[PDB]
């Protein structure tokens, strides 16, 4: 299997500056042991896209700095997003 | 045998900020020579969990900087914890 250690979320298209009012990210993944739980609430790390410094700053949900002891696998994922007071799921696999 | 040189105590779950009013830790282990005694009273070293810097700050009872001359083995352990004025044993193997 191949594990997930992050998410390059929303690469910048022509008309998208939607990563400003959106601040917080919560993942509900399936870990190696006791999968579906509150993995935690963290923020974006807007570094790059595809690891290339010659690229605009896109969002990155850091799937490492969360409340886990094992690793995350490729079965399922739930991606809750937190602005001021919605909890809208922007992405779901 | 495999020796113990520390304790990653209380990895951060969803609802746990119980590592603030809790300050001091005393171990009563079984060393290689003259085991059961007051090994000492020390504090937490809240660095990481599982040695990963992409992880929240969890407690760590340092089982090296204590009053010993030998090493600690995997027979028995007693873990006294000190807040202001309890002495409640939070963990016991």
Answer yes or no: do A69 and B13 touch at CB < 8 A: no
Contacts of B53 (CB under 8 A, 6+ apart): none
DSSP string for B29-88? EEESSS-SS--EEEEB----BTTBSSS---EEE-SSSSS-SS-EEEEEEEEEEESSS---
For residue A79, the 8-state DSSP code is E
Angle (CA) A74-A76-A79 rounded to 5° is: 115
Measured in whole angstroms, the distance separating CA B33 from the mean position of its chain's CA atoms is 20
- β partners of residue B42: B25
Distance CA B34, CA A43 (A): 50
Return the residue in A67, A70, A71 with the most chain B beta carbons within 10 A, the one to mutate for interface testing. Answer: A67
* A61 vs A27: CA distance, rounded Å: 9
CA-based nearest residue to A50, from A40, A63, A60, A41: A60
Contact B54 A37 (CB under 8 A): no
B56-92 b/e (C-beta count within 10 Å ≥ 16 → b): bebbbbbbeebebeeebbeeebebbbeeeeeeeeeee
For residue B4 the two structure tokens come to 């113990």
Structure tokens at A91: 């992405």
Resolution in A: 6.3
Closest CA to A80 of A48, A66, A49: A66
CA distance B40 to B44: 13
CA distance A32 to A70: 6
Nearest to B43 by CA among B64, B30, B24: B24
Interface mutation vs chain B, best among A3, A69, A71, most B CBs within 10 Å: A69
Minimal Cα distance from B53: which residue of A? A65
CA pair distance B55, B77, nearest whole angstrom: 27
Give the integer Cα–Cα distance in Å for B12 and A20. 28
Joined together, the tokens standing for residue B56 give 């929240």
């Amino acid at each position: 299997n191949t594990y997930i250690n992050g998410m390059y979320f929303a690469p910048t298209q022509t008309n998208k500056e939607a990563l400003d009012y959106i601040q917080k990210y919560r993942v509900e993944a399936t870990l190696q042991y006791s999968g579906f739980k509150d993995i935690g609430t963290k923020d974006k790390e807007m570094r790059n896209y595809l690891g290339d410094p010659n690229q605009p700053k896109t969002n990155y949900v850091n799937l490492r700095s969360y409340f886990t002891g094992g690793e995350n696998i490729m079965t399922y994922k739930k991606l809750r997003i937190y602005a001021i007071t919605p909890d809208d799921r922007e992405l779901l696999v």
